[PDB]
Design a protein around this ligand. Structure first.
Ligand SMILES: *[C@@H]1O[C@H](CO)[C@@H](O[C@@H]2O[C@H](CO)[C@@H](O)[C@H](O)[C@H]2NC(C)=O)[C@H](O)[C@H]1NC(C)=O
Ligand SMILES: *[C@@H]1O[C@H](CO)[C@@H](O[C@@H]2O[C@H](CO)[C@@H](O)[C@H](O)[C@H]2NC(C)=O)[C@H](O)[C@H]1NC(C)=O
Ligand code: NAG
Lengths: 51, 107, 173, 173, 173
């Protein structure tokens, strides 16, 4: 498409500044590091105890 | 008469994992893993990729008669081949050092 | 709670408090409410901010990496190349996931710990002038008011200024 | 002991106790004995179980990897291949060993910490009704019995129900 | 301070004390001074020594690694080789830096923690015979002297031997 990115993959373009991505090992541009993960969520807050 | 010390809490449904326990719900959290995309092949620094379509590198460079649409291409951000890139060497033969050549083309 | 405060001697969260991560509850005759602690909260904010940024800096962003082609007499080196690709992919996947597991435990600990610090910093201010009434609560041996409530959260509560009053109160038990 | 309990203010282990990792000792006139704490022990059990499994999941099991042959004009690429083999082997050896070092410290900490939590959770129940007699021991200001011993380990000991008795006892000091 | 002692309830360092990392301050009428704690300090010394050595052992020293040459029809394999060189270099750079970040936090924690242990180990010795006068200080309910100061740092202070004296002193408040 007539479309702009800093990071392209065979599946399509990524527009993100996260450190990791699980879309594709093949990358062109500045991309996040491919990894096999399905979930990478880092706690910042504390345990949410509503009751 | 009283005072108490306590900690925040909210309607979040973010879960994380920890050494000691799975699926812990937390008040705040960042996601490190990017998993969405465009769906599309885009320009990089404003330059379009070269779409070889039904040709492959051989067809393009040699000028396979099926690749006339490419005759005009002269600059690109990256080269795309497709599952249908079969028009290359129309007269049968080896293309010696074809992979080196492709690696050369890469820069 | 490795530090026994969160999910511990202080059982619950305060969906009421929305100022910040750590805070006090108070009920003076004048009324009730919540007031989050600046100093601690801003610290935790700052630190955890640094933690996320520090982890992310350690990740150089990935630059162009496209695969390599090989012809059918190059199976060994095509396999060498896959071994490298797979080898690095295992390592980064392991690093990413393992880090996040381990560091999530540390973060939660941190929060638990800050809370305990807060409590104990108050406790060392009050002593006699109030009693440990459970779940992170003090009960004043003397009467105190909203402006006085601000002396506590101030870290400047004047223990002498009410020690007299509290003495003859406590001694009636 | 980073948390000062184990190998600390509570000097020793109880080869007597065999119910679990954490437990109380009691001697009421009726007799002596050991009773391990369910809630804590089962927690520690559960957690440490999760910890071992989580670490092991991060290890994908190794699949067929047989070495490659090379002829005598292929020394560079045979050396490239050894470099990769040795390079990954260093990394996995370092990861394995380093993890186990670091995580062993965390685990022991965990246990120390659980124990301190236990002690302090009791201490916040008893207060006046007993005194800190050293090495994780309380001494009752009032007389108490086996069924009463179960109120402690219950986390439900009724502080008021003996506060009267203990008061006039303590006040004889 | 994750353990609330350092940069916490004990605000400052003692450029006076130069014996060791942890120590007491005392002022008996006979005079003032500093005396560092052997047992703790030597422990911390020993441990942190082990920590540095353990980390460094995990690093096998690097042996001869000189780069490889390639001719102009070998661009793929020259690129494979650079990928390996760069790949391992990223991993070691990440490991080195990340470890040092994380372990620096643990080390500082350790020191904070040792200090808290010390304080509390004293506190459990004194109780009534002295009061919590803030910032890691006790105030004796009885008079005590230099040789007596050595009973404290001894971990053998005789609580009964001054309990009498301190009782009638404290009770004048
Ligand atoms: C990625 O896409 C998002 C929008 O989907 C863009 O985010 C924007 O950030 C810019 C610049 O800081 C803002 O001016 C926009 O208003 C943001 N958009 C929205 C909807 O809030 C971002 O610009 C995109 N980047 C690229 C390279 O495509
Ligand atoms: C994570 O925690 C959430 C919320 O406590 C759980 O959500 C449940 O998921 C189950 C099983 O798929 C659903 O059928 C329930 O209706 C959900 N319950 C609630 C209270 O939201 C979930 O079980 C947890 N996820 C995992 C993978 O354990
Ligand atoms: C969470 O909080 C926001 C406001 O902070 C609210 O508008 C939103 O609907 C809430 N979600 C739930 C599930 O309560």
């Amino acid at each position: 498409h007539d479309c702009n990115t800093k990071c392209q993959t065979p599946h399509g373009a990524i527009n993100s500044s996260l450190p990791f991505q699980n879309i594709h090992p093949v990358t062109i541009g500045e991309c996040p590091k491919y990894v096999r993960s399905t979930k990478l969520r880092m706690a910042t807050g504390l345990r949410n105890i509503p009751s | 008469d009283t005072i108490c010390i306590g900690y925040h809490a909210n309607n979040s449904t973010d879960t994380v994992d920890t050494v000691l326990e799975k699926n812990v719900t937390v008040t705040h959290s960042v996601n490190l893993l990017e998993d969405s995309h465009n769906g599309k092949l885009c320009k990089l620094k404003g330059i379009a990729p070269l779409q070889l379509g039904k040709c492959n590198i051989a067809g393009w460079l040699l000028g396979n008669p099926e690749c006339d649409l490419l005759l005009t291409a002269s600059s690109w951000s990256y080269i795309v081949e497709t599952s249908n890139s079969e028009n290359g060497t129309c007269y049968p033969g080896d293309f010696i050092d074809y992979e080196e050549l492709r690696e050369q083309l890469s820069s | 709670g490795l530090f026994g405060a969160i999910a511990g001697f202080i059982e619950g969260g305060w969906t009421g408090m929305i100022d910040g991560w750590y805070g006090y509850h108070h009920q003076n005759e004048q009324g009730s409410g919540y007031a989050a602690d600046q100093k601690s909260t801003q610290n935790a904010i700052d630190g955890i901010t640094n933690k996320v940024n520090s982890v992310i800096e350690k990740m150089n962003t990935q630059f162009t990496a496209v695969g390599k082609e090989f012809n059918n007499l190059e199976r060994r080196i095509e396999n060498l190349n896959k071994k490298v690709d797979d080898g690095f992919l295992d390592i980064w996947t392991y690093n990413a996931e393992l880090l996040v597991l381990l560091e999530n435990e540390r973060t939660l600990d941190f929060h638990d710990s800050n809370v305990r610090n807060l409590y104990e910093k108050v406790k060392s201010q009050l002593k006699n002038n109030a009693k440990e009434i459970g779940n992170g609560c003090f009960e004043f041996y003397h009467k105190c008011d909203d402006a006085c409530m601000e002396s506590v959260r101030n870290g400047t509560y004047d223990y002498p200024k009410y020690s007299e009053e509290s003495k003859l109160n406590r001694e009636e038990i």
